[PDB]
Amino acid sequence: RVKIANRELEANGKVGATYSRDLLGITKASLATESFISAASFQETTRVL
């Protein structure tokens, strides 16, 4: 999201956002998902819902 947003903005004249990348465990990097019907298959269903 950030890379497309600030990349198009630098494509225009304004300035983006200096981001500092992270590194997450797989049980923690699979824990965040845009889609929830995916993320309710394996996560705790109640909280996702």
Partner 1 sequence: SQLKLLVTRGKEQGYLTYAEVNDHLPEDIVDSDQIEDIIQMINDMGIQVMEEAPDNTADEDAAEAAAQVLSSVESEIGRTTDPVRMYMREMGTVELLTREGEIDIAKRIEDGINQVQCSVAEYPEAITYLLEQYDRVEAEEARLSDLITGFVDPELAREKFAELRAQYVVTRDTIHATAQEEILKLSEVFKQFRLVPKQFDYLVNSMRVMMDRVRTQERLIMKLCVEQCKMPKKNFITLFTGNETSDTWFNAAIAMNKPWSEKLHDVSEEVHRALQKLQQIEEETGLTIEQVKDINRRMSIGEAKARRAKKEMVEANLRLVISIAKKYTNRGLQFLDLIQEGNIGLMKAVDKFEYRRGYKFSTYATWWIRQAITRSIADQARTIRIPVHMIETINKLNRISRQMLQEMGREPTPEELAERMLMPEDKIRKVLKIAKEPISMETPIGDDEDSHLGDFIEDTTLELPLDSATTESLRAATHDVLAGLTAREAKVLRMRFGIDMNTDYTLEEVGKQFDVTRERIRQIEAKALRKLRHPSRSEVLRSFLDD
Partner 2 sequence: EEFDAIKIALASPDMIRSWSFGEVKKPETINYRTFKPERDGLFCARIFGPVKDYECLCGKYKRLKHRGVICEKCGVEVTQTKVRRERMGHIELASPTAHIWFLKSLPSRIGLLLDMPLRDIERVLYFESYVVIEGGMTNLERQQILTEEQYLDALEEFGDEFDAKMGAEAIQALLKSMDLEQECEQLREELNETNSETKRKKLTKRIKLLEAFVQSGNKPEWMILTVLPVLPPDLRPLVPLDGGRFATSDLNDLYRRVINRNNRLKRLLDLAAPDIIVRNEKRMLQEAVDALLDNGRRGRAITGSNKRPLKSLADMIKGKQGRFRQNLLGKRVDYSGRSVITVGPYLRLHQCGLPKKMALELFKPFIYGKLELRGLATTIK
Chain residues in the site for partner 1 (CB under 8 A): 25, 27-28, 31, 43-44
CA 6, chain centre distance (Å)? 15
Q: In the complex with partner 1, which residue's Cβ is closer, 13 or 25?
A: 25
How far apart are CB 41 and partner 2 at their closest, in Å? 5
Backbone angles phi, psi at 7, to 5 degrees: -70, -40
Q: In the complex with partner 1, which residue's Cβ is closer, 5 or 29?
A: 29
Instruction: Compute CA distances 12 → 1, 5, 6, 9, 16, whole Å.
Output: 17, 11, 9, 5, 10
Q: In the complex with partner 1, which residue's Cβ is closer, 12 or 27?
A: 27
